[PDB]
Amino acid sequence: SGFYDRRFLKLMRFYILLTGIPVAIGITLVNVFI
Amino acid sequence: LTHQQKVLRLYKRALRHLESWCVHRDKYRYFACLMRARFDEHKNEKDMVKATQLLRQAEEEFWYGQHPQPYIFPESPGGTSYERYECYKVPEWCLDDWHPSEKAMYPDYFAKREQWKRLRRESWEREVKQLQEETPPGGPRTEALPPARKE
Amino acid sequence: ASLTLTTLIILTIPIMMSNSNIYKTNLYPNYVKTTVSYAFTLSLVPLLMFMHTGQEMIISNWHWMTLQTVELSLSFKMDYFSVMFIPVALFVTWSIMEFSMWYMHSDPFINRFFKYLVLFLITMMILVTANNLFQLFIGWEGVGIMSFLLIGWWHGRTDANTAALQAILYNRIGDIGFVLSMAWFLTHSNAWDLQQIFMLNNECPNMPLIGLLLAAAGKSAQFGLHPWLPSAMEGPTPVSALLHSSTMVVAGVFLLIRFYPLMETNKLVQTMTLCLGAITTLFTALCAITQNDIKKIVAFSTSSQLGLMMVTIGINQPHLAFLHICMHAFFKAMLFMCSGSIIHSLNDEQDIRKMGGLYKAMPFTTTALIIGSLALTGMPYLTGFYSKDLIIEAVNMSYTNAWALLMTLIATSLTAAYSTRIIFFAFLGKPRFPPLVLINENNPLLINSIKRLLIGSIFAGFIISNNIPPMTVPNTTMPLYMKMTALIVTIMGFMLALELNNTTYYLKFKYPSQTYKFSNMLGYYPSIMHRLPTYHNLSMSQKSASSLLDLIWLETILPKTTSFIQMKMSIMVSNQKGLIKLYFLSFLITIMIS
Amino acid sequence: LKIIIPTTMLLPMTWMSKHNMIWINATVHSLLISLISLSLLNQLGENSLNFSLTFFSDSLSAPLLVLTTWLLPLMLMASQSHLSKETTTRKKLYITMLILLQLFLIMTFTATELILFYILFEATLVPTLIIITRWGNQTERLNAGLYFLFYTLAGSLPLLVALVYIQNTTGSLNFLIIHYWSHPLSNSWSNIFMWLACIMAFMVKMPLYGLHLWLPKAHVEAPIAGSMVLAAVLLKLGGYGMMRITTILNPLTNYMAYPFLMLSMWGMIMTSSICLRQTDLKSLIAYSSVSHMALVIVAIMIQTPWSFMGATALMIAHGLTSSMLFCLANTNYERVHSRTMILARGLQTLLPLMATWWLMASLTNLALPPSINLIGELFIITASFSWSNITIILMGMNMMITALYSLYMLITTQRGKYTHHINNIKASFTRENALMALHILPLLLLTLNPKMILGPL
Amino acid sequence: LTLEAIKDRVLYVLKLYDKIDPEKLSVNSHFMKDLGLDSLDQVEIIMAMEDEFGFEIPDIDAEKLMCPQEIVDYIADKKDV
Amino acid sequence: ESYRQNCAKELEQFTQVSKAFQDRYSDLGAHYSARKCLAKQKQ
């Protein structure tokens, strides 16, 4: 069964990106302006 | 082991290395026929005590000529692919673990499968009693015949 | 500047896409072949800006860790070598992509396989491009471990695993030398950079060059280190084609190529390099004369080519030495892929002796294998010529040890030898593969692949020999047999090998001579250098180290000692008894003493 | 003093936590306090950071401190399925050992008085003993407890008396001033015994080749939460202290290094060689650990600044990778109870992602670029090579065998056929993957920014 | 591959062997009690027959052999048709 | 491809600089300290 692994990756990717987006975008906005 | 099967395996063996040398189907055919001709032309019948000596001769005569590497079919222990696919042959009990969201996707196969597993768990005590029955204290032989069910 | 870095970096992206659902799709790999395609298309451009005006560049976009004095930083030098080499790798690897889509088309996990391909190639790019020596080390070692992941692809059978472990082992033995050199430049030159090191080392370096030489011996499979390369054929064919043909193993000498001027500082380096590269050409080629695998033969061939180009370095002509690689890749990839076509066609039977005589059964593969064999042979205006002839000729007219030159001669003979062996048994005979014939050359992508490599295989020698600036400065005078020798030795090769091979066709059973058993036992070398030292060590690591040295003495010497002495003392002081007269009288005498 | 209070504060929280929720409490807050620990990392490029009169934070300590704070949640994630059937009061008692332990670590890294540093250095011994002895499996653990114990004390006790001595022969025992007021001690015979007295304890706690015997026999026994600490940290702290006390000594070190450089330079190749033929995995890892610590200890003794840089880096990297291999082995041991490596066989066939972690972990065990393990190791080979041109011939052999057995543990317990009858395996929990992802990700990010891990020099 | 293909190709090889007289050959036709071929030729027929497939015959299984149906059964097992 | 030119010029100043810097800060060892650089300078 490959379910448990893919689930794990779904979770992990989802969180690292969950917090991942606000941070990256924040860094970019800080780059272009201030 | 016994003498007859012994000399036989020596024959198939030597014959195969002999192909490994002769390469061409032609030459190989010729020397093959010459070879079997040697085994019969020699002592196709004889007393044993001489015969074993004839083997001890033959083993040497072979071992000298055995060729650094025989041709080997891939399935065979030499093999260019003796276990190429052992990466894949997953034992069945492992599927019995997929959990329902996967198990739902093959209703048919799983159905048939519980049919089987049922057949086994139902069957087992009979193989117990039979194995218990046919066996003496427990000799060299492995397995025993079916008699009314399962085996 | 933007160009080269793009011709690297885009390769990274599919791996990134590896976590994306497209990776899980059947659809993934063709995005990879297309990816390398665009990568190549982009890759040509720097070479042309490099052409007519000839400019070269180094960039070091970002320092990574600023130590005292030393400040290592990633730095992509883009000299002649690094610029010229990239399109080659992209080209052949792209062909390997297209090939592999068919070779594996049945196989599960194929997507993972391609992931490992790109993952390998990118490390190779790390090695060819890197200026800063440490970065060369990451490219080095990383290529090594990719070799490990791919050799073990059919991880089920043990032999694959032993092959993989074997390869990592000999590479590591080379890596010792690499580290020795890598330290010594820092301790002395204080550097790890080709600018620094080239600048400060006008003086003779008596020792770093030899350890670095050993490292060069590592990947390149010199004589002391050859066997892993033949055993590396055990991985599935497109892999062995990928890098054991070219993209990996050539890097081992590529390293030595990068550091020519320092070599030029010494005499003993050029010396010993030649001293060994020659004998590995010979000793490998001899085993190459008499094998039965397609791939083993092609493997011994590739290593022999490597020894040849190794003396090409050792003869103090680095430029041609590099030149030979760029030609060599096409040849070898041709051979392994056509061989892959044969092998897949027949349900995979590597052994020639029951390989059929199928000259007509697969005519296109036939053509391919023919131009390939002629190219490796060194035919006068075909691509292999522009390397090989210039090489061995330059060896002739150079001052040098001669016996090695002799070895180059027998070797270049044997090239023609095994190259005719494989032709003979592969095609000419009345076929003798087992009956049924599933044979099917057809499947267009394969065709296109072999096509492109043929194209390069015939034009590239001329085109590239023409376009490159004349760093060689040609030697073209005395005498006439000078140039003839390269041909006549080949001709002797075909005549002897072929008349011999036909003489094999005339009944009369014979039994092997000792030379046969020798050269066909790969020189006995694996069967003695593997069954022996490993035994003395694995025994020693239990007969001694694991056991008596550290489980039985090292514990006896201070736990068991004290632990025993307290047994004795404790049973002695606490003597259980307690009769008064005893210790009471002891109070007496202890007073008398006190 | 800010990071240290909450670490104490989890204890009331643990005891007062609802009986079936405690793991979440301890986990979450341990993670938070890790993040607070991370702010310490800043240090300074010149002066060592200072705080109270009684603490300070040298760059040498900070990455270690961050690590030590980081490990607690990990040990929790590993433990919290290993035990379940245990009574609530006993479990609640159990995590207290762990946290109490790290509390002693956060105290003993920031030091500052070397007597305070000592008394905590030895205070660590108790909770780890309790854990090895009460929650280890199989009989031998009892005996193991003793080996773990006396080898520390027999080393530590003379060090103790020596410390007291110095603060009498000089002014204060404090580290800063002794760093400044430092004056050479030289030959004679009293000074030599001073030397060994101030070295042997530190060279016991990070195992030395002639003395390492307790360490494997600890790791064979301890429940994994004990293993992760006993490997990843305590060794490293012994190294930290030995790097501390070398502010004194000199020039005598130049004269006394040799014997220990022989036990180390030879013991590395030796133990690695023993490492090449173990019966069971859980030991194999341990000997790999000694085989790497020898590098640290020569790196300290040649005392060249490159060698201390490499010392720091290798200490941390080996910390994480060793702990990783241990949890990663315990998983198998729970799935099949084999312990012996031979029974696992074709584990890759039956499940993939663990094979991936085996790959990453072993891969960084052998150390290939640009793992902080590797870069940590290459420096000390550099400085060693400066110290003696011959020395490379030894180091190279290490880099040979550490390849082999490492790959070996991979290819023997994975690649190959599944054993047939072993039906016990059950397809990988989320916490498992979560755990080892937690080991390995920091280890890889960390390569991007070495400059914050190389330490004071 | 299919069972008929196996039985057919097998007999199709047994037919070509000289010592067998093709009309007497039958799938169930016995090998010693019927037909005098003897083991020294039995080894020939078996190796030559496996050679047609490229398949490999283990020796102890080669000892049984005899009835061609037993053979087609055997390849049927090993190829799992 | 030339060098052994202006590069010799920089090579010289580097020779002087690295010489003196080698002198000021060599075998100090770890725990380098000003008191020690002094102790060397008097030597």
Side-chain angles (χ1 to χ4, degrees), chain C residues 64 68 137 152 161 172 176 538 541-542 545 549-550 554-555 558-559, chain D residues 147 151 209-210 213 270 273-274 277 306 369 385 396 399 415 447:
Chain C
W64 178 76
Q68 75 292 3
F137 178 70
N161 298 134
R172 186 60 59 186
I176 289 173
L538 290 176
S541 179
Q542 163 56 55
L549 178 59
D550 288 346
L554 186 60
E555 181 176 2
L558 66 91
Chain D
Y147 279 153
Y151 270 94
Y209 162 70
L213 295 176
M270 181 62 74
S273 179
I274 295 171
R277 276 173 52 88
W306 284 83
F385 171 71
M399 187 174 283
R415 304 158 78 95
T447 55

mmCIF file of all heavy atoms in Angstrom, chain C residues 64 68 137 152 161 172 176 538 541-542 545 549-550 554-555 558-559, chain D residues 147 151 209-210 213 270 273-274 277 306 369 385 396 399 415 447:
data_model
loop_
_atom_site.group_PDB
_atom_site.id
_atom_site.type_symbol
_atom_site.label_atom_id
_atom_site.label_comp_id
_atom_site.label_asym_id
_atom_site.label_seq_id
_atom_site.Cartn_x
_atom_site.Cartn_y
_atom_site.Cartn_z
ATOM 1 N N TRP C 64 30.463 31.297 -0.079
ATOM 2 C CA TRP C 64 29.653 30.374 0.692
ATOM 3 C C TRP C 64 30.038 30.326 2.148
ATOM 4 O O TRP C 64 29.209 30.017 2.993
ATOM 5 C CB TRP C 64 29.749 28.990 0.068
ATOM 6 C CG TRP C 64 29.014 27.914 0.782
ATOM 7 C CD1 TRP C 64 27.677 27.702 0.777
ATOM 8 C CD2 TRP C 64 29.590 26.827 1.508
ATOM 9 N NE1 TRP C 64 27.373 26.584 1.508
ATOM 10 C CE2 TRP C 64 28.536 26.025 1.961
ATOM 11 C CE3 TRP C 64 30.892 26.471 1.838
ATOM 12 C CZ2 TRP C 64 28.745 24.891 2.724
ATOM 13 C CZ3 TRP C 64 31.099 25.349 2.588
ATOM 14 C CH2 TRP C 64 30.033 24.571 3.026
ATOM 15 N N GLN C 68 39.147 32.585 7.637
ATOM 16 C CA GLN C 68 40.295 33.459 7.694
ATOM 17 C C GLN C 68 41.118 33.188 6.452
ATOM 18 O O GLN C 68 41.164 32.055 5.984
ATOM 19 C CB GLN C 68 41.105 33.202 8.957
ATOM 20 C CG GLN C 68 41.926 31.935 8.928
ATOM 21 C CD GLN C 68 41.082 30.688 8.950
ATOM 22 O OE1 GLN C 68 39.854 30.750 8.941
ATOM 23 N NE2 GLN C 68 41.739 29.538 8.983
ATOM 24 N N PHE C 137 35.246 18.734 -5.811
ATOM 25 C CA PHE C 137 35.114 17.548 -4.988
ATOM 26 C C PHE C 137 33.661 17.158 -4.802
ATOM 27 O O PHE C 137 33.344 15.971 -4.820
ATOM 28 C CB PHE C 137 35.791 17.739 -3.642
ATOM 29 C CG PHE C 137 35.659 16.561 -2.728
ATOM 30 C CD1 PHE C 137 36.321 15.386 -2.998
ATOM 31 C CD2 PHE C 137 34.930 16.644 -1.572
ATOM 32 C CE1 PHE C 137 36.221 14.309 -2.161
ATOM 33 C CE2 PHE C 137 34.836 15.567 -0.729
ATOM 34 C CZ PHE C 137 35.478 14.401 -1.030
ATOM 35 N N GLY C 152 22.967 -0.307 -8.829
ATOM 36 C CA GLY C 152 22.203 -1.215 -8.005
ATOM 37 C C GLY C 152 20.738 -1.232 -8.364
ATOM 38 O O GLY C 152 19.911 -1.653 -7.562
ATOM 39 N N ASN C 161 24.394 -5.633 -6.290
ATOM 40 C CA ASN C 161 24.814 -4.952 -5.088
ATOM 41 C C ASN C 161 26.316 -5.026 -4.892
ATOM 42 O O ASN C 161 26.949 -4.031 -4.544
ATOM 43 C CB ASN C 161 24.092 -5.529 -3.886
ATOM 44 C CG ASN C 161 22.603 -5.344 -3.974
ATOM 45 O OD1 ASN C 161 21.838 -6.268 -3.729
ATOM 46 N ND2 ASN C 161 22.181 -4.144 -4.340
ATOM 47 N N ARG C 172 36.548 5.239 -3.792
ATOM 48 C CA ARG C 172 36.961 5.790 -2.522
ATOM 49 C C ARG C 172 38.464 5.713 -2.374
ATOM 50 O O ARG C 172 39.109 6.647 -1.870
ATOM 51 C CB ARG C 172 36.289 5.048 -1.384
ATOM 52 C CG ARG C 172 36.568 5.666 -0.061
ATOM 53 C CD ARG C 172 36.052 7.074 -0.113
ATOM 54 N NE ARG C 172 34.628 7.077 -0.403
ATOM 55 C CZ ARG C 172 33.917 8.170 -0.633
ATOM 56 N NH1 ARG C 172 34.497 9.360 -0.610
ATOM 57 N NH2 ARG C 172 32.625 8.069 -0.886
ATOM 58 N N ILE C 176 41.035 8.928 -1.520
ATOM 59 C CA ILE C 176 42.097 9.184 -0.553
ATOM 60 C C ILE C 176 43.155 10.096 -1.136
ATOM 61 O O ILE C 176 43.581 11.073 -0.512
ATOM 62 C CB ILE C 176 42.780 7.897 -0.101
ATOM 63 C CG1 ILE C 176 41.843 7.085 0.784
ATOM 64 C CG2 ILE C 176 44.070 8.204 0.626
ATOM 65 C CD1 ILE C 176 42.381 5.722 1.134
ATOM 66 N N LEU C 538 38.632 -9.295 6.618
ATOM 67 C CA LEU C 538 37.420 -9.684 7.315
ATOM 68 C C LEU C 538 37.712 -10.740 8.361
ATOM 69 O O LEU C 538 37.030 -10.826 9.369
ATOM 70 C CB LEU C 538 36.364 -10.169 6.329
ATOM 71 C CG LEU C 538 35.841 -8.999 5.510
ATOM 72 C CD1 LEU C 538 34.881 -9.446 4.466
ATOM 73 C CD2 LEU C 538 35.147 -8.080 6.447
ATOM 74 N N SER C 541 39.400 -8.722 11.167
ATOM 75 C CA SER C 541 38.482 -7.841 11.854
ATOM 76 C C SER C 541 37.603 -8.609 12.814
ATOM 77 O O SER C 541 36.695 -8.052 13.406
ATOM 78 C CB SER C 541 37.621 -7.091 10.860
ATOM 79 O OG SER C 541 36.720 -6.248 11.545
ATOM 80 N N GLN C 542 37.853 -9.902 12.925
ATOM 81 C CA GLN C 542 37.172 -10.772 13.876
ATOM 82 C C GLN C 542 38.141 -11.668 14.592
ATOM 83 O O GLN C 542 38.015 -11.907 15.785
ATOM 84 C CB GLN C 542 36.127 -11.624 13.175
ATOM 85 C CG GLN C 542 35.652 -12.818 13.977
ATOM 86 C CD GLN C 542 35.108 -12.448 15.325
ATOM 87 O OE1 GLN C 542 34.203 -11.631 15.436
ATOM 88 N NE2 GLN C 542 35.641 -13.072 16.365
ATOM 89 N N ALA C 545 40.546 -7.935 15.922
ATOM 90 C CA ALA C 545 40.015 -6.657 16.359
ATOM 91 C C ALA C 545 38.707 -6.766 17.110
ATOM 92 O O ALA C 545 38.603 -6.309 18.239
ATOM 93 C CB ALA C 545 39.832 -5.776 15.177
ATOM 94 N N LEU C 549 41.243 -8.464 20.704
ATOM 95 C CA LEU C 549 41.791 -7.157 20.973
ATOM 96 C C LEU C 549 40.862 -6.286 21.791
ATOM 97 O O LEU C 549 41.319 -5.539 22.643
ATOM 98 C CB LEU C 549 42.133 -6.449 19.678
ATOM 99 C CG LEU C 549 42.668 -5.042 19.887
ATOM 100 C CD1 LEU C 549 43.906 -5.085 20.747
ATOM 101 C CD2 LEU C 549 42.997 -4.459 18.549
ATOM 102 N N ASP C 550 39.561 -6.393 21.568
ATOM 103 C CA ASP C 550 38.654 -5.425 22.174
ATOM 104 C C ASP C 550 37.444 -5.993 22.874
ATOM 105 O O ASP C 550 36.716 -5.261 23.530
ATOM 106 C CB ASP C 550 38.176 -4.435 21.125
ATOM 107 C CG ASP C 550 39.256 -3.468 20.713
ATOM 108 O OD1 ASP C 550 40.276 -3.382 21.422
ATOM 109 O OD2 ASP C 550 39.083 -2.776 19.691
ATOM 110 N N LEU C 554 40.791 -5.894 26.086
ATOM 111 C CA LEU C 554 40.638 -4.502 26.419
ATOM 112 C C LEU C 554 39.651 -4.402 27.565
ATOM 113 O O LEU C 554 39.646 -3.432 28.308
ATOM 114 C CB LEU C 554 40.181 -3.708 25.206
ATOM 115 C CG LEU C 554 40.121 -2.203 25.414
ATOM 116 C CD1 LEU C 554 41.499 -1.736 25.784
ATOM 117 C CD2 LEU C 554 39.671 -1.523 24.146
ATOM 118 N N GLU C 555 38.820 -5.427 27.700
ATOM 119 C CA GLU C 555 37.933 -5.561 28.841
ATOM 120 C C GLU C 555 38.586 -6.284 30.006
ATOM 121 O O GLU C 555 38.220 -6.086 31.152
ATOM 122 C CB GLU C 555 36.667 -6.295 28.426
ATOM 123 C CG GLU C 555 35.664 -6.482 29.530
ATOM 124 C CD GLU C 555 34.400 -7.134 29.039
ATOM 125 O OE1 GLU C 555 34.333 -7.468 27.841
ATOM 126 O OE2 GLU C 555 33.469 -7.300 29.848
ATOM 127 N N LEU C 558 41.024 -3.820 32.577
ATOM 128 C CA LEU C 558 40.629 -2.901 33.641
ATOM 129 C C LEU C 558 39.197 -3.054 34.181
ATOM 130 O O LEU C 558 38.958 -2.737 35.336
ATOM 131 C CB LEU C 558 40.902 -1.460 33.192
ATOM 132 C CG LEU C 558 40.176 -0.756 32.057
ATOM 133 C CD1 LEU C 558 38.981 -0.053 32.626
ATOM 134 C CD2 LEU C 558 41.079 0.213 31.337
ATOM 135 N N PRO C 559 38.238 -3.525 33.379
ATOM 136 C CA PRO C 559 37.076 -3.903 34.178
ATOM 137 C C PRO C 559 37.299 -5.187 34.962
ATOM 138 O O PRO C 559 37.182 -5.194 36.188
ATOM 139 C CB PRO C 559 35.987 -4.096 33.138
ATOM 140 C CG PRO C 559 36.383 -3.231 32.037
ATOM 141 C CD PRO C 559 37.870 -3.288 31.979
ATOM 142 N N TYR D 147 28.745 -0.158 33.746
ATOM 143 C CA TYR D 147 29.838 0.270 32.904
ATOM 144 C C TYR D 147 29.671 1.704 32.537
ATOM 145 O O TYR D 147 30.648 2.427 32.429
ATOM 146 C CB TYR D 147 29.971 -0.561 31.643
ATOM 147 C CG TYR D 147 30.693 -1.840 31.881
ATOM 148 C CD1 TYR D 147 30.466 -2.946 31.099
ATOM 149 C CD2 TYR D 147 31.668 -1.918 32.847
ATOM 150 C CE1 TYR D 147 31.156 -4.107 31.308
ATOM 151 C CE2 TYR D 147 32.356 -3.074 33.063
ATOM 152 C CZ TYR D 147 32.098 -4.166 32.290
ATOM 153 O OH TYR D 147 32.788 -5.329 32.504
ATOM 154 N N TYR D 151 33.008 4.289 34.661
ATOM 155 C CA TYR D 151 33.914 4.861 33.688
ATOM 156 C C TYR D 151 33.814 6.364 33.640
ATOM 157 O O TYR D 151 34.804 7.033 33.390
ATOM 158 C CB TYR D 151 33.664 4.303 32.298
ATOM 159 C CG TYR D 151 34.428 3.059 31.932
ATOM 160 C CD1 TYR D 151 33.899 1.805 32.110
ATOM 161 C CD2 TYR D 151 35.676 3.161 31.354
ATOM 162 C CE1 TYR D 151 34.602 0.690 31.741
ATOM 163 C CE2 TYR D 151 36.382 2.057 30.983
ATOM 164 C CZ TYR D 151 35.841 0.823 31.179
ATOM 165 O OH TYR D 151 36.546 -0.288 30.802
ATOM 166 N N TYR D 209 39.579 5.177 22.227
ATOM 167 C CA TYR D 209 39.647 3.808 21.744
ATOM 168 C C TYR D 209 40.035 2.772 22.783
ATOM 169 O O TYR D 209 39.594 1.634 22.711
ATOM 170 C CB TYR D 209 40.618 3.742 20.579
ATOM 171 C CG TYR D 209 41.111 2.358 20.263
ATOM 172 C CD1 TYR D 209 40.276 1.408 19.710
ATOM 173 C CD2 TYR D 209 42.432 2.022 20.469
ATOM 174 C CE1 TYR D 209 40.738 0.148 19.412
ATOM 175 C CE2 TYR D 209 42.903 0.769 20.166
ATOM 176 C CZ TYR D 209 42.053 -0.163 19.637
ATOM 177 O OH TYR D 209 42.525 -1.414 19.339
ATOM 178 N N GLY D 210 40.840 3.151 23.759
ATOM 179 C CA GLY D 210 41.242 2.197 24.767
ATOM 180 C C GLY D 210 40.226 2.061 25.876
ATOM 181 O O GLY D 210 40.374 1.227 26.761
ATOM 182 N N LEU D 213 34.728 0.854 25.909
ATOM 183 C CA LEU D 213 33.984 -0.388 26.001
ATOM 184 C C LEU D 213 32.584 -0.238 26.546
ATOM 185 O O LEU D 213 31.687 -0.963 26.147
ATOM 186 C CB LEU D 213 34.744 -1.372 26.863
ATOM 187 C CG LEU D 213 36.054 -1.731 26.188
ATOM 188 C CD1 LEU D 213 36.854 -2.632 27.077
ATOM 189 C CD2 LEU D 213 35.765 -2.388 24.858
ATOM 190 N N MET D 270 40.881 1.009 13.731
ATOM 191 C CA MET D 270 40.578 -0.250 14.376
ATOM 192 C C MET D 270 39.098 -0.447 14.637
ATOM 193 O O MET D 270 38.507 -1.426 14.185
ATOM 194 C CB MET D 270 41.314 -0.353 15.690
ATOM 195 C CG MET D 270 41.041 -1.644 16.370
ATOM 196 S SD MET D 270 41.643 -2.936 15.298
ATOM 197 C CE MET D 270 43.395 -2.748 15.528
ATOM 198 N N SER D 273 37.144 -0.895 11.778
ATOM 199 C CA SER D 273 37.290 -2.227 11.235
ATOM 200 C C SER D 273 36.382 -3.204 11.949
ATOM 201 O O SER D 273 35.783 -4.058 11.313
ATOM 202 C CB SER D 273 38.731 -2.698 11.330
ATOM 203 O OG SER D 273 38.850 -4.013 10.825
ATOM 204 N N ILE D 274 36.261 -3.073 13.266
ATOM 205 C CA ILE D 274 35.360 -3.944 14.016
ATOM 206 C C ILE D 274 33.951 -3.661 13.562
ATOM 207 O O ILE D 274 33.088 -4.532 13.519
ATOM 208 C CB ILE D 274 35.449 -3.719 15.526
ATOM 209 C CG1 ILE D 274 36.817 -4.115 16.055
ATOM 210 C CG2 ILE D 274 34.417 -4.534 16.242
ATOM 211 C CD1 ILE D 274 37.023 -3.712 17.484
ATOM 212 N N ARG D 277 32.159 -5.699 10.817
ATOM 213 C CA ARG D 277 31.605 -7.047 11.008
ATOM 214 C C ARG D 277 30.765 -7.319 12.246
ATOM 215 O O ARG D 277 30.975 -8.322 12.919
ATOM 216 C CB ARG D 277 32.725 -8.065 11.015
ATOM 217 C CG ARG D 277 33.171 -8.527 9.679
ATOM 218 C CD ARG D 277 34.375 -9.395 9.876
ATOM 219 N NE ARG D 277 34.132 -10.448 10.852
ATOM 220 C CZ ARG D 277 33.632 -11.641 10.572
ATOM 221 N NH1 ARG D 277 33.322 -11.960 9.333
ATOM 222 N NH2 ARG D 277 33.452 -12.523 11.539
ATOM 223 N N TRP D 306 42.108 25.413 12.671
ATOM 224 C CA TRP D 306 41.332 24.636 11.722
ATOM 225 C C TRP D 306 40.768 23.425 12.402
ATOM 226 O O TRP D 306 39.629 23.026 12.171
ATOM 227 C CB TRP D 306 42.205 24.202 10.562
ATOM 228 C CG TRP D 306 42.477 25.280 9.632
ATOM 229 C CD1 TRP D 306 43.429 26.232 9.745
ATOM 230 C CD2 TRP D 306 41.823 25.507 8.391
ATOM 231 N NE1 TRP D 306 43.394 27.066 8.662
ATOM 232 C CE2 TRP D 306 42.412 26.636 7.812
ATOM 233 C CE3 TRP D 306 40.788 24.869 7.714
ATOM 234 C CZ2 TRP D 306 42.000 27.144 6.595
ATOM 235 C CZ3 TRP D 306 40.382 25.372 6.508
ATOM 236 C CH2 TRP D 306 40.986 26.495 5.959
ATOM 237 N N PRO D 369 29.967 15.390 0.033
ATOM 238 C CA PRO D 369 29.747 16.829 -0.039
ATOM 239 C C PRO D 369 28.325 17.180 -0.382
ATOM 240 O O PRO D 369 27.661 16.415 -1.068
ATOM 241 C CB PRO D 369 30.661 17.261 -1.174
ATOM 242 C CG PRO D 369 31.656 16.250 -1.260
ATOM 243 C CD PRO D 369 31.021 14.970 -0.895
ATOM 244 N N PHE D 385 47.161 17.082 8.684
ATOM 245 C CA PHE D 385 48.158 16.927 7.655
ATOM 246 C C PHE D 385 49.241 17.966 7.795
ATOM 247 O O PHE D 385 50.397 17.707 7.480
ATOM 248 C CB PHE D 385 47.534 17.003 6.273
ATOM 249 C CG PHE D 385 48.535 17.052 5.180
ATOM 250 C CD1 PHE D 385 49.285 15.945 4.875
ATOM 251 C CD2 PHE D 385 48.714 18.202 4.448
ATOM 252 C CE1 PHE D 385 50.213 15.986 3.873
ATOM 253 C CE2 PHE D 385 49.635 18.252 3.439
ATOM 254 C CZ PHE D 385 50.387 17.141 3.149
ATOM 255 N N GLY D 396 42.942 8.429 5.418
ATOM 256 C CA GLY D 396 42.360 7.929 4.201
ATOM 257 C C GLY D 396 41.722 6.584 4.447
ATOM 258 O O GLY D 396 40.619 6.337 3.959
ATOM 259 N N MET D 399 38.310 6.845 5.709
ATOM 260 C CA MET D 399 37.339 7.298 4.742
ATOM 261 C C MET D 399 37.017 6.155 3.805
ATOM 262 O O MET D 399 36.019 6.185 3.096
ATOM 263 C CB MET D 399 37.863 8.514 3.995
ATOM 264 C CG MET D 399 36.851 9.149 3.079
ATOM 265 S SD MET D 399 37.445 10.686 2.347
ATOM 266 C CE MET D 399 37.245 11.818 3.720
ATOM 267 N N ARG D 415 18.165 -3.957 0.634
ATOM 268 C CA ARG D 415 18.171 -4.477 -0.715
ATOM 269 C C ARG D 415 18.329 -5.989 -0.637
ATOM 270 O O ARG D 415 19.132 -6.482 0.144
ATOM 271 C CB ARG D 415 19.308 -3.811 -1.476
ATOM 272 C CG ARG D 415 19.174 -2.298 -1.440
ATOM 273 C CD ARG D 415 20.495 -1.592 -1.689
ATOM 274 N NE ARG D 415 20.954 -1.518 -3.066
ATOM 275 C CZ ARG D 415 20.724 -0.478 -3.856
ATOM 276 N NH1 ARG D 415 20.047 0.566 -3.398
ATOM 277 N NH2 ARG D 415 21.185 -0.468 -5.093
ATOM 278 N N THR D 447 23.721 23.202 6.065
ATOM 279 C CA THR D 447 24.857 23.324 5.166
ATOM 280 C C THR D 447 24.897 24.670 4.469
ATOM 281 O O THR D 447 25.962 25.146 4.089
ATOM 282 C CB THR D 447 24.844 22.235 4.111
ATOM 283 O OG1 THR D 447 23.594 22.268 3.420
ATOM 284 C CG2 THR D 447 25.016 20.891 4.750
#
